[PDB]
Structures are given as C-alpha cells and as structure tokens.
Amino acid sequence: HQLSRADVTTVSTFIDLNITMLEDHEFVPLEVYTRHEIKDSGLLDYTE
C-alpha cells in the first residue's frame, strides 16, 4: 500500500509555548478639572 502523512497518527515531541505580543494602547488626554473649570470655580472674577 501507500499512505500519506495525514493517514498516520501524529504524536509530538515538541513542548508548546504560546507567547503573544502586548497590544498597542492609546492614552487619551484626561483631566479631572480643566483650567477653565478651575478659573470658573471662583465666585467673583475681578477682571470681569
């Protein structure tokens, strides 16, 4: 007869190691209070 490699049961001598890359991350600007908010927190603005 003749056979292909797919017709034969395959066992592995290889030890698995699944390493995945760290993914690209984007940091958006973020502020708790904008400087306009901080300016506006005062009750009276002398200039205005």
Partner 1 sequence: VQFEQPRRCPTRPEGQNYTEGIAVVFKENIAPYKFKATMYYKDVTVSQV
Contact residues: partner 1, CB under 8 A: 5, 8-14
Containing 45, the helix (H) or strand (E) segment is: none
Tokens of 33: 């209070």
- Closest contact distance (angstroms) between CB of 7 and partner 1 is 10
Report the residue number, 12 or 41, with the smaller CB distance to partner 1. Answer: 12
How far is it, in rounded angstroms, from Cα 6 to Cα 33? 65
- Closest contact distance (angstroms) between CB of 25 and partner 1 is 16
- Closest contact distance (angstroms) between CB of 34 and partner 1 is 12
How far is it, in rounded angstroms, from Cα 13 to Cα 29? 50
